[PDB]
């Protein structure tokens, strides 16, 4: 049900999905273990700001500081590539199969 159509035949590369995966993985796991562990202001502040940018940055704004600029695949802008392949969901459904 998840399946994503890769542009290169199925590669994930440097995309902000992978950037938010590297930041949201450690920041989200350390945020869960920190919140459940009653972490102090240092770990709850760093994990709350890093995880806050993990959930919030994937939602809106953020800086596309992914790998090196240029010569890299960057299929994340509004995170609308999931709902709309090109002009919409037509390729998946409501258009010709």
């Amino acid at each position: 049900l998840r399946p994503l159509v890769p542009l290169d035949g199925g590669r994930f590369a440097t995309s902000d999905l992978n950037d938010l995966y590297r930041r949201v993985i450690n920041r989200n796991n350390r945020l869960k273990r920190l919140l459940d562990l009653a972490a102090p202001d240092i770990i709850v502040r760093n994990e709350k700001r890093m995880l806050q940018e993990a959930v919030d940055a994937l939602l809106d704004n953020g800086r596309r500081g992914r790998a090196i600029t240029g010569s890299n695949k960057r299929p994340l802008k509004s995170l609308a590539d999931m709902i709309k392949g090109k002009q919409g969901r037509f390729r998946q459904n409501l258009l010709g199969k």
């Binding site: 049900l1 998840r2 399946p3 994503l4 159509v5 939602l59 999931m82 709902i83 969901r89 037509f90 998946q92 459904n93 409501l94 258009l95 010709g96 199969k97």
Partner: protein, 1340 residues
Amino acid sequence: MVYSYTEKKRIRKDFGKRPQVLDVPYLLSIQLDSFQKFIEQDPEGQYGLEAAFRSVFPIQSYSGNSELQYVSYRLGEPVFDVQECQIRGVTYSAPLRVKLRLVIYEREAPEGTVKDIKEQEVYMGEIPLMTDNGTFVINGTERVIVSQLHRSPGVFFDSDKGKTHSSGKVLYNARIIPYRGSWLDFEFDPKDNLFVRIDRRRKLPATIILRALNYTTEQILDLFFEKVIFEIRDNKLQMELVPERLRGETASFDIEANGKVYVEKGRRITARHIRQLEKDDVKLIEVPVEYIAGKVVAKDYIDESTGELICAANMELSLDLLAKLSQSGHKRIETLFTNDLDHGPYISETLRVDPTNDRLSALVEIYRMMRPGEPPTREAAESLFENLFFSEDRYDLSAVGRMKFNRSLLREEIEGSGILSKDDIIDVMKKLIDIRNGKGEVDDIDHLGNRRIRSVGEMAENQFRVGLVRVERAVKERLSLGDLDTLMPQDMINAKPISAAVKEFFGSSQLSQFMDQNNPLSEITHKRRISALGPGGLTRERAGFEVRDVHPTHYGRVCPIETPEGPNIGLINSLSVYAQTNEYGFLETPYRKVTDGVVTDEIHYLSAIEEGNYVIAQANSNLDEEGHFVEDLVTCRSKGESSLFSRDQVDYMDVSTQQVVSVGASLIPFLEHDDANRALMGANMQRQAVPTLRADKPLVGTGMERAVAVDSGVTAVAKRGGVVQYVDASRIVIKVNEDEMYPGEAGIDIYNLTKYTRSNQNTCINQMPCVSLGEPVERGDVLADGPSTDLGELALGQNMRVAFMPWNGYNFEDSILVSERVVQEDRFTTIHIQELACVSRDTKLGPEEITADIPNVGEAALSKLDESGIVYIGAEVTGGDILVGKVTPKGETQLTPEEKLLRAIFGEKASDVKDSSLRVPNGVSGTVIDVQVFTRDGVEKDKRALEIEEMQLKQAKKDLSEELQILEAGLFSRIRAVLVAGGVEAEKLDKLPRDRWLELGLTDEEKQNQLEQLAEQYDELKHEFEKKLEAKRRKITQGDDLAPGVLKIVKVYLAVKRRIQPGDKMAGRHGNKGVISKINPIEDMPYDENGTPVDIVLNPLGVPSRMNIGQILETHLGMAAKGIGDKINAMLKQQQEVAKLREFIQRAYDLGADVRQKVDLSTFSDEEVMRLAENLRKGMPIATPVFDGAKEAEIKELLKLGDLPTSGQIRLYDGRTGEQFERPVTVGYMYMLKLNHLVDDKMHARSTGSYSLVTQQPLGGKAQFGGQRFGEMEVWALEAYGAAYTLQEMLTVKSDDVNGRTKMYKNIVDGNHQMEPGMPESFNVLLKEIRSLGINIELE
């Protein structure tokens, strides 16, 4: 001369009275010339590797006291061969040599040097080379770079009037474009102020950047403007007169010039009152005070009494300010003209609006405008201003930069500084102020005088130079790291930037690509192409208007006919046959010089700029023996038009009429008759024709293809021709004549013919001998023919019988009707060679052994595969049969220790579960050509490739042993010659070696000298030949470099015979290309008075409908040609004597009025052309030039001479009913075309097949699955027909629903016929994705 040795087999009959003085050039000289100038050694420092090494070198670190001087470079020989390298499939590149020398300077000690550093060459990168045909060999691919076209560097004058801006007025602009670096442009606004835009940044006023050039306002007005003159002595207010500098006046009072009034108060300002004071000589005059307040001050004058800044330059004067200035004791006053007639108040609004009045604040402001993030620190502003504006590295004006810069600058010397100049940009601002003033002419964007083509030389020079700079950075770090470095150019220079730049450049680029090969035609016309794509020259991805148009500069160089009829039109072009590239990249075309009233025989190449002013006559014109023109008023052209001009107004001539066409469309005869649109379509269809079995030279033709076939490099030609010794399909050798030979090495020239080989188009290529044996060969003669070539003459299609007719509705629109006779004649049959490669290996579970078993499969495939090796060569592979067995380790060991040492795994030994086998895909069946597999170092116990590894050794040993026998045999015969009179014996020497025992003793000198010499060069040629034989065998058995991600590579060639097909497709030379409806029996074809059923049936309505004229003259003239060949063939049926037929052959050559230099029987009359009668017995090779082609008078005269009815219509009877058709019917013989559109390749039927994990929709076509696609247009087509079923179950049951397929196939049993509507899983991919979205929707 008219020797015509190689053309004596077939002499193609030529038409037209227009001679060609300048022969067709080699025509590849753009790629060959660009390559040979790309690798060269010159002291002048021409553009190339020497220009890059001299550009970057010397390489010196900052404050390191170390420099690097260039020894330039020299190129070596590649490790592999051309054809052999293409067979191996590895990139073809020569290493680079001659590394640069270093230098060391003593620290704190001037001129002190410890020692000079001269180092041996170091390996850097790999430089690919080019084949003689113009291709590039990388990984066994064709790799040709398309020619590029873009703007040439120089000062541009552009109109740039926006149609979307709604202003309705033109906004002028000018931009200097260097070959590299940032761009500098100027921009107007309605405020009438000069603006500056640099690299898309916001436009700053001219006063801030020109202030950053360190020019004060006094130098601005005094430089760009004239201060005129104003003088005040005791307020006398005397000024000079400028009566010719302005037209106008406003006079409120009388003005007297030297005691006489020039213009009275209120008097007329007309030229009657102007020229009175103008033509006469007048000096400075005195006028009242009120005229100062209206004028604008020019220079900066300050009061001499006190030090205030009042009365600054570029400011308005006030009535009360005149009293403060004039009374201050100023010596002189400068006032601006500032009257708009031919001029304008430029730079004023720039000075007023410009915030920065100084160069420092100007540099800070332009720095802040360049970098938005960091506030300028004022420290680097000088380096940013210099490096941004005038610098050596960031300018790169190159050649055309200063050439066009001085041309538009109206300078004298061509050579100039390669960096920006302050007086140069000030001249651009002044002449641009003239453009805003209204005087001067703008320049056209589409005018090719402003365009320059770029090729492999300049492009590879650019990328290689970039990589060389990337090396200069790291080398600069290495030299800057240490204080003193001995033997620095060793480990400091890395090859990865070079090899990455050139290997990534030629490896992957928009211009560099492999070609689809159909006939030599598509190879040569695909070799020469103009592309506006790639870097630069591309305005937008789609649409566009004025960019795709055709300018008058497109006449004599680029062909407007040939063009990419697909999505992008007007971009790709094709150069003219006689076109050439200038030194700056400009394109020049030939014109014949004309002096006084006679036409001299010299021809000069002219570009657009030079030929624009000159007047040149029309291509076709009347010529006389005295050189003068017959008609007084001759059609000529000057600029952008053409009209009748006098005989004294014609500067040059167009020579041939073919200068406007290209090689692609130039082979289409009767171009002036056929419409240009359908000729464009046909020229677009010429490149897709697949070569067939038997190549029959076109009986209607041009005569350019004779040079195209030999100049395409496809056919096998001969160097230093001679008497042929041995012939074969694999190899051809020739004994070279003694006329021209090299004194050393002796030997003869050997040739290795290429067998059937796969191309990039999956076609079949091969070369066949045109000579028998013992035939003398000249220099340049073609020995063998490539694919779709006959006797060195290009034939990419087959002729066949032609009749114009509706037949029982089977021919509708463009539909085609083919007889079963041609079906039985093997014609149109072609070979399609597909390559199958099974390459995996590379497993951490252990290596994968090739073949030796097929797991879980019976002996059916084991009968085809060898025990220790792969299948027999040339076998029958049908369906999913395994062509090459391959195994995999898979589970390897496990409990029950690998099933008791593969006991339960039977005889595989891997254990079980090897999917690595090739398993030929379904639907593809044919015969295999050859298995090239792979060649690795240190590999053993491989039964595969053994036969070819031995075959290469026997081949090289055979052809090398031939030359060895020529050498040792020649010197041995020399021994037999020298032993004469020194103790010779014919009976003894003719039955024994040694030569009586090494020439015996004789006279002492011959003993030691002749015998010791014979042994010396005898053992030298024997031991040297064996040493070279071992050196070659080592190259045969060493192999190539395999991809590291595999242990062993396997690749196999397979071929399929595909012939004329019912669906198929066919094409004409004039652009008619259609599918065949049905292939009809011979008995159903109408026959003539002689009972000869017709092969093809076309639709005559397409001649008026699609405006195709050339089909009538094509078929009729062809009927005349085959009438000649039919009558001569009848003479051979009667076995007539040579002379009786020789008379009709000669009459066939010289019939008509001139239009050729050919004369029959000229050479011995009893051979050559005499046998060429038996060569042309099938058909007559008639040619017509492009625009000079035959006329209906000579066509009906020849066809009437061929005993055929002059009208070209023969009474025809029905083949079916036998009854006669009413009225005569047009028949003839035309040249047809077989394409790649055959419906075995196009058509694939599929039902159920593999799907994808994404949405559960199958991938698409070419996968032997899927239903093709019915898109949204078909969705709205089912909504249009009103069928809810077909659409609803369409989108759901087939893909998004598994329930629909399972229940559907289950209902096929007993035929329940119901299909489940289902819940779409693709709609569950939409619900899915939405669930991943922060708003997740769930059903209730």
